[PDB]
């Protein structure tokens, strides 16, 4: 069977490739979590803007009732 | 020891592959269960803002498009 050094070298290169894959996938995980947090922040800002804009229909209802 | 290295590297490949599988599954769960519902909530909030501003839309569109 194939020269031991060749097999072992192939397995080391697979090791190092998979090690970059592991560290990179951890980075991908943390990146996705941080992106989710950013989307949460932006959605909360939108919620605050919607709450502020909600006064307009209240004003319209008040005018209609007082009519 | 010269044969044992092959077995050790095989074990390393196995554990590394398991780690990759776990990380990818975590990414999938994060996306599907967090980001999509958040986008839906953002869409609903934007629709609420649009609803509150309809009368401005009529006021402007009726006379100036």
């Amino acid at each position: 069977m194939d020269s031991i050094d060749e097999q072992i070298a192939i397995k080391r290169k697979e090791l190092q490739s998979l090690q970059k894959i592991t560290s990179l996938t951890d980075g991908l995980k943390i990146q996705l979590t941080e992106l989710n947090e950013q989307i949460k922040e932006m959605g909360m800002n939108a919620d605050s803007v919607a709450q502020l804009m909600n006064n307009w229909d209240s004003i319209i209802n008040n005018i209609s009732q007082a009519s | 020891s010269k044969e044992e290295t092959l077995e050790k590297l095989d074990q390393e490949i196995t554990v590394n592959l398991q780690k990759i599988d776990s990380n990818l599954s975590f990414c999938f769960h994060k996306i599907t269960q967090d980001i999509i519902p958040h986008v839906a909530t953002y869409s609903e909030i934007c629709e609420r803002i649009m609803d509150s501003t309809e009368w401005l839309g009529t006021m402007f569109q009726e006379t100036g498009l």
């Binding site: 319209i60 005018i63 209609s64 009732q65 009519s67 | 009368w55 839309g57 009529t58 006021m59 009726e62």
Partner: peptide
């Protein structure tokens, strides 16, 4: 997608009338 009402401030004429006229009768 339907358009809004050209008079924005709609007077609730009907609901007020249907009960206030009976109140005036009473």
């Amino acid at each position: 997608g339907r358009p809004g009402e050209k008079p924005i401030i709609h007077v609730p004429k009907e609901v007020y009338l249907n009960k206030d006229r009976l109140d005036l009768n009473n």
